[PDB]
Write an enzyme that holds these catalytic residues in place. Structure first.
Site, PDB file in Angstrom:
ATOM      1  N   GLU A 209       0.823  -1.191   0.000  1.00 39.61           N
ATOM      2  CA  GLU A 209       0.000   0.000   0.000  1.00 39.61           C
ATOM      3  C   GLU A 209       0.869   1.259   0.000  1.00 39.61           C
ATOM      4  O   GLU A 209       1.908   1.328   0.657  1.00 39.61           O
ATOM      5  CB  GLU A 209      -0.879  -0.039   1.234  1.00 39.61           C
TER       6      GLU A 209
ATOM      7  N   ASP B 268      12.467  -3.295  14.565  1.00 37.79           N
ATOM      8  CA  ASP B 268      12.920  -2.082  13.897  1.00 37.79           C
ATOM      9  C   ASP B 268      11.863  -0.997  13.946  1.00 37.79           C
ATOM     10  O   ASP B 268      11.571  -0.367  12.926  1.00 37.79           O
ATOM     11  CB  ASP B 268      13.273  -2.363  12.460  1.00 37.79           C
TER      12      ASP B 268
ATOM     13  N   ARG C 102      11.064   6.487  11.266  1.00 38.17           N
ATOM     14  CA  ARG C 102      11.314   6.302   9.834  1.00 38.17           C
ATOM     15  C   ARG C 102      10.579   5.077   9.309  1.00 38.17           C
ATOM     16  O   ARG C 102      10.464   4.894   8.085  1.00 38.17           O
ATOM     17  CB  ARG C 102      12.789   6.106   9.575  1.00 38.17           C
ATOM     18  N   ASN C 103      10.102   4.219  10.212  1.00 33.96           N
ATOM     19  CA  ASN C 103       9.381   3.002   9.802  1.00 33.96           C
ATOM     20  C   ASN C 103       7.877   3.068  10.081  1.00 33.96           C
ATOM     21  O   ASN C 103       7.199   2.045  10.125  1.00 33.96           O
ATOM     22  CB  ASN C 103       9.981   1.767  10.481  1.00 33.96           C
TER      23      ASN C 103
ATOM     24  N   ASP D 130       8.115  -1.739   7.187  1.00 31.27           N
ATOM     25  CA  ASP D 130       9.464  -2.312   7.226  1.00 31.27           C
ATOM     26  C   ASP D 130       9.645  -3.504   8.161  1.00 31.27           C
ATOM     27  O   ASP D 130      10.301  -3.392   9.195  1.00 31.27           O
ATOM     28  CB  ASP D 130      10.456  -1.222   7.599  1.00 31.27           C
TER      29      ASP D 130
HETATM   30  N1  LIG Z   1       4.602   2.684   1.098  1.00 32.75           N
HETATM   31  C1  LIG Z   1       5.378   3.780   1.114  1.00 32.75           C
HETATM   32  N2  LIG Z   1       4.838   4.972   0.766  1.00 32.75           N
HETATM   33  C2  LIG Z   1       5.601   6.053   0.773  1.00 32.75           C
HETATM   34  N3  LIG Z   1       6.862   6.016   1.105  1.00 32.75           N
HETATM   35  C3  LIG Z   1       7.458   4.850   1.474  1.00 32.75           C
HETATM   36  C4  LIG Z   1       6.687   3.692   1.473  1.00 32.75           C
HETATM   37  N4  LIG Z   1       7.507   2.706   1.862  1.00 32.75           N
HETATM   38  C5  LIG Z   1       8.708   3.219   2.107  1.00 32.75           C
HETATM   39  N5  LIG Z   1       8.680   4.538   1.861  1.00 32.75           N
HETATM   40  C6  LIG Z   1       9.832   5.457   1.967  1.00 32.75           C
HETATM   41  O1  LIG Z   1      11.045   4.684   1.903  1.00 32.75           O
HETATM   42  C7  LIG Z   1      11.654   4.706   3.211  1.00 32.75           C
HETATM   43  C8  LIG Z   1      12.358   3.393   3.564  1.00 32.75           C
HETATM   44  O2  LIG Z   1      11.459   2.284   3.448  1.00 32.75           O
HETATM   45  P1  LIG Z   1      11.679   0.925   4.280  1.00 32.75           P
HETATM   46  O3  LIG Z   1      11.906   1.274   5.718  1.00 32.75           O
HETATM   47  O4  LIG Z   1      10.603  -0.016   3.962  1.00 32.75           O
HETATM   48  O5  LIG Z   1      13.045   0.318   3.684  1.00 32.75           O
HETATM   49  P2  LIG Z   1      14.374   0.146   4.588  1.00 32.75           P
HETATM   50  O6  LIG Z   1      14.506   1.297   5.520  1.00 32.75           O
HETATM   51  O7  LIG Z   1      14.420  -1.213   5.139  1.00 32.75           O
HETATM   52  C9  LIG Z   1      15.707   0.281   3.364  1.00 32.75           C
HETATM   53  P3  LIG Z   1      17.200  -0.576   3.923  1.00 32.75           P
HETATM   54  O8  LIG Z   1      16.781  -2.089   4.284  1.00 32.75           O
HETATM   55  O9  LIG Z   1      18.295  -0.522   2.927  1.00 32.75           O
HETATM   56  O10 LIG Z   1      17.623   0.123   5.314  1.00 32.75           O
HETATM   57  C10 LIG Z   1      10.520   5.052   4.166  1.00 32.75           C
HETATM   58  O11 LIG Z   1      11.074   5.642   5.353  1.00 32.75           O
HETATM   59  C11 LIG Z   1       9.856   6.150   3.335  1.00 32.75           C
HETATM   60  O12 LIG Z   1      10.695   7.300   3.286  1.00 32.75           O
HETATM   61 MG   LIG Z   2      13.792   1.466   7.469  1.00 32.18          MG
END
Ligand SMILES: Nc1ncnc2c1ncn2[C@@H]1O[C@H](COP(=O)(O)OP(=O)(O)CP(=O)(O)O)[C@@H](O)[C@H]1O
Ligand SMILES: [Mg+2]
Lengths: 226, 307
Positions: free
Chosen positions: B99, B160, B164-165, B178
């Protein structure tokens, strides 16, 4: 599950849901001379995820919190700690027969309340749009099915503007107390009327498929032909 | 090509990728258009978010993403959890379709809602209607508690939890995201990190930090930090403190200070979450209920008292 009825859901696209529900019940009950117990179930503004039962009682609209709990695998709904149901339906049903015991007194919910303000938050609905003002918007959308619904100065009446066969065509809707009439046809509210023709044909098998507005133009709209 | 799932698998060609939304060390999320997500609406386009591995992704990262996807299927749908829409697992890169949260992560959401300050004004004087109130802040903490409570009832630890999550939708609903570090503990009642690797230390509880022990109790710790993040409107936990010194600080009973403009009860809530004895910290059921009361009391909106 919930299929409209007293179930209004989201009001004002998440904005001022209580207030919107108060004006919707007040002016409606004051006029229609509604009995105590008139109600609707809306999404809760204060407690995101839960519900709210808003009702009419002695010239005043009061709200009751409907707790929800999805832990026992099955959803649960209740207003008190001694009574629980598997659905809003069985819950509303129940409090129609059995009263509501509070501090003041008791009260059995009486009759539902239609969605009289539902259109005021919709994309296709406009409150102050001249016909030319409307035609100009549909002129910037070279398609068939694009539409909108403007309110006219004349009391209790709205027009439906749409693009049929590559040409602008309008339709007259008249508010008759608490029901909307599309010529001979009759519906419960604008939203119930648009909802209908979003499936069924409105003119030459032309159905309301593409609501139109400023942002809708930012997705289709160019400069206007004639 | 790994075990396809007719339940979630979606034709790789019914997905049109767009611009980036956020990245990290090895992973990325990009906006996209999904044609006919629902079988009864084959032509309705749904804006969605797709998570995938980066160019420099390792074998290990792929398994983490597989896991992440399985976790979301096992956890189930919830008002405050980002819902899984489907996936592309066959003959090509693994795509986890989820989503789309139009307002980004909570950290960013909150910062863009911070005040100008006295004697200062904003330009181009942005939306003064979205500036959050004390009621809205509690509502965000409450929503996340409700989602964690549901996650704990499913016998799962996130590991986690951080601003940011936590994603924020169009109508401002908090969605916990996440799940790449999440784990199932249905029978064991804990997870012990065996291998080594990257970890969000500033959000981790002592025991998960030193003893590698994870439970709902350590998630609650992270939630304490999340609360701090919320009430500072996007601040950074333990600002200016080097991580290597964080270890020394925690081992000595150091906790963060109270964020200015934050009731004492909410600060006490943070403290409870940071309790040295894991079994003494509130559980998520207690946090939801406490936060429920505060939401009811902070928003001066009267309701029928049936008791
Ligand atoms: N469904 C969504 N809608 C809008 N933005 C999103 C989103 N999913 C992720 N994001 C953006 O991407 C960022 C990082 O996403 P996510 O936390 O899922 O990956 P992550 O942090 O695990 C990358 P890594 O594993 O390399 O650290 C979120 O903080 C947001 O800024
Ligand atoms: Mg993250």
């Amino acid at each position: 599950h919930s299929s409209e009825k007293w179930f209004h859901g989201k009001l004002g696209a998440g904005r001022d849901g209580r207030h919107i529900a108060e004006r919707l019940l007040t002016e409606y009950c004051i006029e229609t001379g509604a009995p105590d117990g008139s109600f609707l179930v809306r999404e809760s503004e204060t407690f995101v995820g839960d519900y709210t039962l808003s009702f009419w009682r002695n010239g005043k609209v009061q709200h009751c919190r409907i707790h929800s709990r999805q832990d026992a695998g099955t959803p649960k709904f209740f207003l008190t700690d001694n009574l629980v149901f598997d659905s809003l339906y069985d819950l509303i049903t129940h409090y129609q027969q059995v009263p509501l015991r509070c501090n003041e007194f008791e009260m059995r919910l009486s009759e539902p309340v239609p969605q009289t303000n539902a259109h005021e938050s919709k994309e296709w609905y406009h409150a102050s749009l001249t016909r030319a003002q409307a035609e100009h918007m549909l002129m910037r959308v070279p398609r068939d099915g694009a539409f909108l619904v403007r309110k006219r100065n004349e009391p209790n009446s709205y027009a439906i503007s749409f693009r049929a066969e590559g040409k602008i065509k309008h339709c007259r809707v008249q508010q008759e107390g608490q029901t909307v009439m599309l010529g001979n046809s009759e519906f419960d509210s604008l939203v119930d009327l648009i909802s209908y023709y979003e499936k069924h044909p409105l003119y030459r098998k032309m159905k309301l498929r593409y609501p139109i507005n400023e942002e809708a133009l930012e997705k289709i709209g160019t400069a206007e032909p004639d | 090509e790994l075990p396809e799932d007719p339940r979630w698998e979606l034709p790789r060609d019914r997905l049109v990728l767009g611009k980036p939304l956020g990245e990290g060390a090895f992973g990325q999320v990009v906006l996209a258009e999904a044609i006919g997500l629902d079988k009864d609406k084959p032509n309705r386009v749904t804006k969605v978010a797709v998570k995938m591995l980066k160019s420099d992704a390792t074998e290990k990262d792929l398994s983490d993403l597989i896991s992440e996807m399985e976790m979301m299927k096992m956890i189930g749908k919830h008002k405050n959890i980002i819902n899984l829409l489907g996936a592309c697992t066959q003959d090509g890169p693994l795509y986890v379709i989820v989503e789309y949260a139009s307002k980004g992560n909570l950290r960013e959401y909150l910062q863009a809602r911070r005040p100008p300050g006295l004697e200062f004004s904003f330009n181009p004087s942005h939306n003064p209607e979205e500036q959050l109130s004390s009621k809205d802040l509690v509502s965000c903490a409450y929503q996340v508690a409700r989602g964690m409570e549901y996650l704990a009832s499913k016998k799962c630890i996130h590991r986690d939890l951080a601003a940011r999550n936590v994603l924020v939708t169009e109508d401002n609903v908090m969605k916990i995201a996440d799940f790449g570090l999440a784990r199932d503990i249905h029978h064991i009642d804990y997870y012990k990190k065996t291998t080594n690797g990257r970890l969000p230390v500033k959000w981790m509880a002592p025991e998960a930090l030193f003893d590698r022990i994870y439970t709902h109790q350590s998630d609650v710790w992270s939630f304490g930090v999340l609360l701090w993040e919320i009430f500072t409107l996007g601040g950074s936990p333990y600002p200016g403190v080097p991580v290597e010194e964080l270890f020394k600080l925690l081992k000595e009973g150091h906790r963060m200070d109270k964020p200015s403009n934050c009731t004492n009860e909410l600060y006490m809530m943070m403290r409870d979450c940071w309790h040295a004895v894991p079994s003494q910290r509130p559980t998520f059921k207690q946090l939801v209920e406490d936060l429920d009361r505060i939401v009811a009391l902070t928003s001066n909106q009267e309701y029928l008292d049936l008791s």
